[PDB]
Write a protein that binds this ligand. Structure first.
Ligand SMILES: O=C(O)C1=C[C@@H](OP(=O)(O)O)[C@@H](O)[C@H](O[C@@](OP(=O)(O)O)(C(=O)O)C(F)F)C1
Length: 445
């Protein structure tokens, strides 16, 4: 069932900690490692529930996965070598695993079924199912193109050129993965850049994949299908979405100085840091380096006084998952913060725009929720914020709503309670221990 947790006002947060691995890259390490020819070795893998579910799905299709010491070792089946799964592939809470695997296996000439939890089962799959239908995949789904879904690929898939209609890295990724088992050239056109882990990693595994960016920013991504993929050595960088929680906590809690090590700094993932810096945040980028083919750095974060800012719609893709924690930081900034271009927040683990606005109001914050926007006016000293009666924020099975509001309680005059902390382990099982080590006071019911 559910397990509520309550966060209480803290004295400064202090320490140096290594953040857990990046979820986006961890999911893809299991997928590409499972598909490629030969052996793939992975260090720094995120072992949250979401990633483990992807691992079990690849095993169900023939990949062998094991953990030796601190390294995950995978024996892949080779491109075109996936085997028909015996039972439905259960992705739990993870849309990333579900949507990417739909493209990967949907083009194979055997049936595959996809299921998930109460949250995933309400999310839209049409955005990935439509291009697959164009590629010749037969689709069976519930009303609204929701799970459960059963796919059956054609004997010979059809390559397509697909312009992604919304700024989704998962749709782009699903089409490219379907392209791996399709003869000919598959092309994805992305008018606004989204996280590029799929493109970079496929190139690293040997795929004939090119990316061309027009001066106007439009990206044309071409992949030649049915080519060989070769197992690789992968070093996963720290998760920038997970980093956001102790980072914002350190900015807000007076008397704080927290350093987070080995953080992924790919610009498609750093919109929150840029936004916080414009608000006056003291974030130091230390020893920027190249690790495992990605840009990483350590970040030293210190208590700062923040001021409201305008966050443009075009920055959304580079920080889509950090809007909840940004909304909490704004609740303590001087003045108003306005964020627009938020339509995508409504189809995540929870409708994040509605869950954030209701949670902020329950905890005394002045804010205005629009169809696709949010305005927050802060109270720097935190007085009158939080909930003295102990009323719980509804998380709607969304672990980022739970983590964002627990950070708020470390700063507000009154404690902040969330109705469920059990979903935090989907992407950040280390959260409670990591925050407690820095000095945070969070009581688990
Ligand atoms: O390809 C990826 O790795 C992701 C792409 C994005 O989705 P879109 O392509 O729809 O923009 C993120 O929002 C998603 O993160 C969440 O991913 P999951 O649903 O759990 O898998 C998250 O971590 O918060 C979010 F979508 F909920 C992970």
């Amino acid at each position: 069932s559910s397990r509520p947790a309550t966060a209480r006002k803290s004295s400064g947060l202090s320490g140096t900690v290594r953040i857990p691995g990046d979820k986006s890259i961890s999911h893809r390490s299991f997928m590409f490692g499972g598909l490629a020819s030969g052996e793939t070795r992975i260090t720094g893998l995120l072992e949250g529930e979401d990633v483990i579910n992807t691992g079990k799905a690849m095993q169900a299709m023939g990949a062998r996965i094991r953990k030796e010491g601190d390294t995950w070792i995978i024996d892949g089946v080779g491109n075109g070598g996936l085997l028909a799964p015996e039972a439905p592939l259960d992705f739990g809470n993870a849309a990333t695993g579900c949507r990417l695997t739909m493209g990967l296996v949907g083009v194979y000439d055997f049936d595959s079924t996809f299921i998930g939890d109460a949250s995933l089962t309400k999310r839209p799959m049409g955005r990935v199912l439509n291009p697959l239908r164009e590629m010749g995949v037969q689709v069976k789904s519930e009303d609204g193109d929701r799970l459960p879904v059963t796919l059956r690929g054609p004997k010979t898939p059809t390559p397509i050129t697909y312009r992604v209609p919304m700024a989704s890295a998962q749709v782009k990724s699903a089409v490219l993965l379907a392209g791996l088992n399709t003869p000919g050239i598959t092309t994805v056109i992305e008018p606004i850049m989204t996280r590029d882990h799929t493109e970079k990693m496929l190139q690293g595994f040997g795929a004939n994949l090119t990316v061309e960016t027009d001066a106007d920013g439009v990206r044309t991504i071409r992949l030649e299908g049915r080519g060989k993929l070769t197992g690789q050595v992968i070093d996963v960088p720290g998760d920038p979405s997970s980093t956001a929680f102790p980072l914002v906590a350190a900015l807000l809690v007076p008397g704080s100085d927290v350093t987070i090590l080995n953080v992924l700094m790919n610009p498609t993932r750093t919109g929150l840091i840029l936004t916080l810096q414009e608000m006056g945040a003291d974030i130091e980028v230390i020893n920027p380096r190249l690790a495992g083919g990605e840009d990483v750095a350590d970040l030293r974060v210190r208590s700062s006084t923040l001021k409201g800012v305008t966050v443009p719609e075009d920055r959304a893709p580079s920080m889509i998952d950090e809007y909840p924690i940004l909304a909490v930081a704004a609740a303590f900034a001087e003045g108003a913060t306005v964020m627009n271009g938020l339509e995508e927040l409504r189809v995540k683990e929870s409708d994040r725009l509605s869950a954030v606005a209701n949670g902020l109001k329950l905890n005394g914050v002045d804010c205005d929720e629009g169809e696709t926007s949010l305005v927050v006016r802060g109270r720097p000293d935190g007085k009158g914020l939080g909930n003295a009666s102990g009323a719980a924020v509804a998380t709607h099975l969304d672990h980022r709503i739970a983590m964002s509001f627990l950070v708020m309680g470390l700063v507000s005059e009154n404690p902040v309670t969330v109705d469920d902390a059990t979903m935090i382990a989907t992407s950040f099982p280390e959260f409670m221990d990591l925050m407690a080590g820095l000095g945070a006071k969070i009581e688990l019911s």
